[PDB]
Design a protein around this ligand. Structure first.
Ligand SMILES: Cc1cc2nc3c(=O)[nH]c(=O)nc-3n(C[C@H](O)[C@H](O)[C@H](O)COP(=O)(O)O)c2cc1C
Ligand SMILES: Cc1cc2nc3c(=O)[nH]c(=O)nc-3n(C[C@H](O)[C@H](O)[C@H](O)COP(=O)(O)O)c2cc1C
Lengths: 193, 193
């Protein structure tokens, strides 16, 4: 099997979600050792903002963007397990992750319109979302990130999604420790499945 | 009173939300004619992506970004009625609007931490969200944009928010007409209040 890991934090080596993603990769290498793992850091290697010119896809800029979209989509379709690091910034996902989504959602490519509604074309995937927050939002009205990810990933065909939460990072060393340890335990559950 | 209008579509003159925002401005000029109106187009004059360097705010780049944040925040606080055009792209708001939000949310400036929780510092505002969608999501599970806007605006102090929907734009000329006419009627209700 092939694992794709998508990093999206702007906090680099101090990122909670990157730390957890790195733990996931270490554990996967140990316990599913046949598997190939690809790590794409959407902060280290940013994806452009979808603007009028890019959606309008040609200008050299439009051709580059189309090529990139194509690369990202081919990479997504080429992996079996998709790990998405989704830190919350201002009640949204990071813009780094969003830009990725805006180039991967493409009619006729990652979803198609049918008589019954749109249907996703990225099928047979298993996703794991590692989502870090300073506060505590899980199962509450201020967590729009979780249902949005479920909705967006479902739309492109990725309906099997497991969420790993690291919440309360901002509430002191103990709460932060608890967030890390609970997330690592959830990851270990998944890895050993 | 002073009106701030924030445009965020990438579709320029073909934007449904910009058309509706322009209708709002025309009607406000007619019916609340003392009032000053400022229009900021976040697509025509884009706000940078919040990245590690910008949040880390100094480098010339950090100083520029801080100055811009300051300008945007002062403009927000200087207006009484805030009209936010919020087209939905891939189940999110536009990145153009998001970048704006990422520079306006600032501890000690647009919200403060208190014993009782964070509290918004942008007070006494009335907001109108004009939100356009190709499909139909209102009061359903795939509308995360609405609660996210309520949540984000509430966090900075803007708790009085009225939503104007233009849905089903993608479902033919009649549905699109209905979206426009229903949104214009809602706008007329607000304007005549
Ligand atoms: C720009 C910025 C905005 C943030 N806004 C939120 C917020 O809306 N909700 C919250 O619970 N935490 C907020 N936080 C805290 C982050 O969620 C927390 O630091 C988390 O660990 C981020 O993941 P990371 O360390 O992988 O980047 C914010 C942090 C940053 C840098
Ligand atoms: C990049 C892109 C993504 C879109 N994704 C969605 C979607 O998630 N939900 C939906 O209902 N409509 C979707 N649409 C349709 C827009 O919501 C619709 O065209 C609306 O009129 C946009 O407002 P605007 O004309 O002001 O830009 C999308 C349109 C674009 C350009």
């Amino acid at each position: 099997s092939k694992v794709l890991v998508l990093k999206s934090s702007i906090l680099a080596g101090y990122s909670q979600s990157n730390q957890l993603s790195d733990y996931f990769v270490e554990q996967w290498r140990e316990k599913h050792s046949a598997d190939e793992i690809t790590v794409r850091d959407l902060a280290a290697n940013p994806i452009p903002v979808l603007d009028g010119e890019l959606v309008g896809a040609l200008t050299p800029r439009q051709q580059e963007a189309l090529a990139l979209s194509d690369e990202l989509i081919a990479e997504l379709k080429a992996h079996d397990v998709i790990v998405i690091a989704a830190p919350m910034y201002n009640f949204n996902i990071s813009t780094q992750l969003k830009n990725y989504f805006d180039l991967v959602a493409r009619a006729g490519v990652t979803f198609r319109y049918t008589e019954n509604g749109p249907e996703g074309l990225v099928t047979g995937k298993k996703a794991i979302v590692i989502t870090s927050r300073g506060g505590i939002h899980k199962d509450g009205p201020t967590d729009l990130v979780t249902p949005y990810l479920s909705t967006f990933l479902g739309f492109i065909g990725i309906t099997d999604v497991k969420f790993v939460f690291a919440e309360g990072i901002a509430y002191g060393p103990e709460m932060a420790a608890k967030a890390q340890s609970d997330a690592k335990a959830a990851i270990d559950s998944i890895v050993s499945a």
